[PDB]
Design a protein around this nucleic acid. Structure first.
Ligand SMILES: [Cl-]
Ligand SMILES: [Cl-]
Ligand SMILES: [Cl-]
Ligand SMILES: [Cl-]
Ligand SMILES: [Mn+2]
Ligand SMILES: [Mn+2]
Ligand SMILES: [Mn+2]
Ligand SMILES: [Mn+2]
Ligand SMILES: [Mn+2]
Ligand SMILES: [Mn+2]
Ligand SMILES: [Mn+2]
Ligand SMILES: [Mn+2]
Lengths: 104, 78, 92, 97, 96, 108, 84, 99
DNA sequence: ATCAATATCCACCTGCAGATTCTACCAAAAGTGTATTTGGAAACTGCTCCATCAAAAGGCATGTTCAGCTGAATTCAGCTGAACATGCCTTTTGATGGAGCAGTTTCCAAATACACTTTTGGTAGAATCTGCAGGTGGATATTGAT
DNA sequence: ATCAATATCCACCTGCAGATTCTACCAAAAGTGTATTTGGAAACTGCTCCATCAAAAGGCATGTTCAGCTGAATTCAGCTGAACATGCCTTTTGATGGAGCAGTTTCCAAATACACTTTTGGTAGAATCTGCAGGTGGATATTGAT
């Protein structure tokens, strides 16, 4: 009977609410705010896990590791823009060699 | 200690960076940059340590330091 | 003590890839990700409400914050999900 | 006596290292430098192992990223060899200077 | 039916006379000075707010402000800012 | 009731301690605000506007003006290493830039 | 009112030259003018988009200076002088 | 004569002149017209406080000037004196505006 | 482009250990049921400000010429930086202990939040004041041709 | 090494658009008398954190060789700067209408506050597993050589 189940979400609406209140963002917090915010966070998480899962599969792996999260973020124009100032520990970089540096 | 950061290790970093040919003066230049980076980050972190009245620099202190420096890092508590 | 979004990230992982697992380090990355986006949405909603001299952050601030923070398509879908969850939450 | 031409092994290293994610700086030397720098801000400090690892992760990502811009700056000058001059330009444009 | 809007102009102007008794300031320059004060205020408060949150503390004290100032300001600017702040507080508390 | 003493006068400051204390409570920075906080902040703010007005007033003097204008504020900020870093991502409307011509560009 | 079109060309060659002059540039290739317009437009769209988003959120029809100031702060291009 | 300044002399005269002043360099009306066109493509029926248009021009000009300085360094670095789209693109990429 | 001889990659399997995933249980959130507070939406409407227009003027944007000198190509060789076989030692890493220390408790005196009630410090215009924007003119370079 | 040709300065001038002051309330500090926290201050733990110890193993520091990259020196086609003639359209000044901010009230749907009642998520052992790290054995990619 939790708010998440009511909102039809996996992410914790009750916690997102407690975090909004205790985070000194505003004097009051609407009832829909935690639901909305929770849905946004779950969605973006699904987006990364989806693409990251794909990266694992394309590597003959079943377990997503940092490398996969990096490959998913950097190979996605939007996710990359959104996390352009963030570094994924243990993710390395995309393989890429400036044409001019190749042989012959 | 900074000479501890060796030529070959700097070569490696440059390689992951896609660099093919390296000038001989790059190694010392790199050490200088590396040092300014660590000083800036550590200074902030230790400031978070001291504020918390601790004697131990925590990953979180570093993470918060990195965020202030516009170098957000994922994997160590944020 | 010491709570994290792990349980939740994992559940979501199973819906999109029932077959896929996730390492501890990768789980750490996801937590950082959620905390970061949460801080960015929250912070912006905070500013929006302050700019407009409002004392409460409603889903309306969360939405605008989302439009301001997420790039194009990511913003559309996020908005879609957001209003969808609020709709469902208010019905029953 | 077999011998690869200059640049051939370099290109090979780029492919190898751009493929992995392992830290490229030896751990002890790095930990040593971290503590030395820190000692100048507050004496007798302790470090969580993860604190040292976060710093090394941050530091190496920064340097790798910086080398990419440096490389772009060298290529811009019709070169294939990076120089302090290239690192300097990148840092200036980045606003780190 | 007025709609009054606060500003730091009165205070900026007083500090101006103190440092340069002979000098005036255009409204555009005062506009800039107002943006500046509001900006550093936000940066300091923002940093103080975070600092307190990281330390499970519900109250921002002169101590958060101090560490925020050290985090925000560069070298000499910080040292002098900290001295003025510390001074003002001890004076204020010494009832002084 | 005794005669009112402003907290600013108590703090020995020109900047508004009461205003700053209010701005702190209404800015959603924390549940509660200490009594010293607004004093310490008002002092730092006053000190910073004192530092830039000092340098700007001088630029005004150098340009033979008695009234500080935006350009004076710019010259003072960009010519001071510390203020420049502090406001490195700030733009002063009507400030222009520092006269600066790369050497390679001068008549050979 | 009246159709608005091609106003980007209102950013003339001489105006771009002047801007490069203040920026310390001595010589300018003929293709700089079109690149500059493209960069200006991208910069302007992004700021206007955010400014208008702050406008809409306040249920106003008038984009205010504060809307722009907040848009600039978001983009990390803080502007002093219009905070009124 | 007729007297003629050598190419490069007047350009340097202009750098000194504009680095001395602070007036906006793009014509007012044309710029307001561009703002209205872009805005309109985002949301119809918008109005602008005159002050809002000026905040934008001040910001766009400060931005272009700073970008040209960076572009200029990229040209000098290429051992040139003439800025080209190439330099602007290199500067923007390093600035992280378009890696 | 082949011929040949190194070394490099690169699939396919394969065997365990380091993690993961799976279980078995308890406090600290999260969900309820009530009972009030209140933020800020809805309904006017006072009235700044923004969109338009008219109109005359000259500051500038346009285009065109012309040719100075800059960017783009070539060529060339001195010498820096890559590839390597060598020899050695600093980094790894794995316990083993001991201990400096984050984390918790239990109070509590000091410091804050509150709810009112007075008291000014500030802000919004009028009433006064005045730098200095714009104009002029020789003194001083600053340039570029003989 | 000169000088015309112009551009650049600097000081002297003078009313007016833009500051500085002068006035008047009144929104919001300040002064008081209570009602909560709050953040320490000691006292003690379970730990993560340094220290050695102590081997071995890659991984690094060197000295050689020379391939091939960077830079310097020369050319030269033609791009882009400087000047000029023309006349367009941005600037300036004012005047209006009225769109749509902003200020005020009026007042519920919605959020805050408990006082409890349940439920879930964080822990700490227990029961699997995904790859890592080797092992071949087989085409590949390189670089010397017809
Ligand atoms: Cl809501
Ligand atoms: Cl160099
Ligand atoms: Cl305090
Ligand atoms: Cl180009
Ligand atoms: Mn003085
Ligand atoms: Mn109310
Ligand atoms: Mn040339
Ligand atoms: Mn040779
Ligand atoms: Mn008074
Ligand atoms: Mn003048
Ligand atoms: Mn459970
Ligand atoms: Mn393998």
């Amino acid at each position: 009977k939790t708010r998440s189940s009511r909102a039809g979400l996996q992410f914790p609406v009750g916690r997102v609410h407690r975090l909004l209140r205790k985070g000194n963002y505003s004097e009051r917090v609407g009832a829909g705010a935690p639901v909305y915010l929770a849905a946004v966070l779950e969605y973006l998480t699904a987006e990364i896990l989806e693409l990251a899962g794909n990266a694992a599969r394309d590597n003959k792996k079943t377990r997503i590791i940092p490398r996969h999260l990096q490959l998913a973020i950097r190979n996605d124009e939007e996710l990359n823009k959104l996390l352009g100032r963030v570094t994924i520990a243990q993710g390395g970089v995309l393989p890429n060699i400036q044409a001019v540096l190749l042989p012959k | 200690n900074i000479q501890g950061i060796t030529k070959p290790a700097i070569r490696r970093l440059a390689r992951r960076g896609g660099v093919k040919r390296i000038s001989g003066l790059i190694y010392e230049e790199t050490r200088g940059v590396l040092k300014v980076f660590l000083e800036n980050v550590i200074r902030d972190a230790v400031t978070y340590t001291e504020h918390a009245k601790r004697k131990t620099v925590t990953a979180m202190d570093v993470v918060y330091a990195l965020k202030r420096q516009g170098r957000t890092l994922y994997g160590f508590g944020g | 003590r010491k709570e994290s979004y792990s349980i939740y990230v994992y559940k979501v992982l199973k819906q999109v890839h029932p077959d896929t697992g996730i390492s501890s380090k990768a789980m750490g990355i996801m937590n950082s990700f959620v905390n970061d986006i949460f801080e960015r949405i929250a912070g912006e909603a905070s500013r929006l409400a302050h700019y407009n001299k409002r004392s409460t952050i409603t889903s309306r601030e969360i939405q605008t914050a989302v439009r301001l923070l997420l790039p194009g398509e990511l913003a559309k879908h996020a908005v879609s999900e957001g209003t969808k969850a609020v709709t469902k939450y208010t019905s029953a | 006596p077999h011998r690869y031409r200059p640049g051939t092994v370099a290109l090979r290293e780029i492919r190898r290292y751009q493929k992995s994610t392992e830290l490229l700086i030896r751990k002890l030397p790095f930990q040593r430098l971290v503590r030395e720098i820190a000692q100048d801000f507050k004496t007798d400090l302790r470090f969580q192992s993860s604190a040292v690892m976060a710093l090394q992760e941050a530091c190496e990502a920064y340097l790798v990223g910086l080398f990419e811009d440096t490389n772009l700056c060298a290529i811009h000058a019709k070169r294939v060899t990076i120089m302090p001059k290239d690192i300097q330009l990148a840092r200036r444009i980045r606003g780190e200077r």
